[PDB]
């Protein structure tokens, strides 16, 4: 019932041989946290693109991929967005604060 | 339930 603040940040990632180097959970019908439909980052691979860049963190909400908004979408819709990317990907995330 | 690595 108290206010919850987030910091909104854009992160540009360049894929490596193993892709972006993180995992997502969440989505409408696939809640990562009860009552929350957000897409969440849940894993970051050591040595991967997200790791080396150093901005993305476990616990971050994934708000968008490129021009595709991921607020209140299904896990499948989030995956579809991430699948349809080139070697350069712009993520919009919300970090706890 | 569903988790995806990318």
Author numbering:
A (entry chain A): 310 to 406
B (entry chain B): 2838 to 2843
Publication excerpt:
Dlg1 is a MAGUK protein family member localized to polarized structures including epithelial junctions, stem cell cortical regions, and neuronal synapses. MAGUK proteins adhere to a common domain architecture comprising one to three PDZ domains that bind target proteins, an SH3 domain, a variable HOOK sequence, and an enzymatically inactive guanylate kinase domain. One example of a molecular bridge between the membrane and the microtubule cytoskeleton is the complex formed between Dlg1 and APC, a protein that binds polymerizing microtubule plus ends in an EB1-dependent manner. Collectively, the Dlg1-APC-EB1 complex mediates a dynamic link between polarized membrane regions and the microtubule cytoskeleton.
Here I report the crystal structure of the Dlg1 PDZ2-APC complex determined to a resolution of 2.0 Å. This structure shows an extensive interaction between PDZ2 and APC that spans the ultimate six APC residues and highlights additional binding determinants that likely promote the PDZ2-APC interaction. To examine the molecular basis for the Human Dlg1 PDZ2– APC interaction, the Dlg1 PDZ2 domain (residues 310–407) was purified and complexed with a peptide corresponding to the C-terminal 11 residues of APC with an N-terminal TMR fluorophore covalently bound. Strong electron density was evident in the PDZ peptide-binding site and the final six C-terminal residues of the APC peptide could be assigned and built into the electron density. Nestled in the hydrophobic groove is the APC peptide in a β-strand conformation, running anti-parallel to the adjacent βB strand and parallel to the αB helix. Specifically, the APC V2843 carboxylate group makes hydrogen bonds with the backbone amides of L329, G330, and F331. The APC T2841 side chain hydroxyl makes a hydrogen bond to the H384 ring Nε while the T2841 Cβ and Cγ atoms make van der Waals contacts with I333 and V388 respectively. V2840 contributes to the anti-parallel β-strand interaction while the backbone spanning APC Y2838 and L2839 is stabilized by a hydrogen bonding network with the Dlg1 N339 carboxamide group. In the Dlg1 PDZ2-APC structure presented here, αB is displaced, opening the PDZ peptide-binding furrow, enabling APC to bind the length of the furrow. The order Q340 confers to the βB-βC loop orients the N339 side chain towards the APC peptide, promoting its hydrogen bonding to the APC V2840 backbone amide and carbonyl.
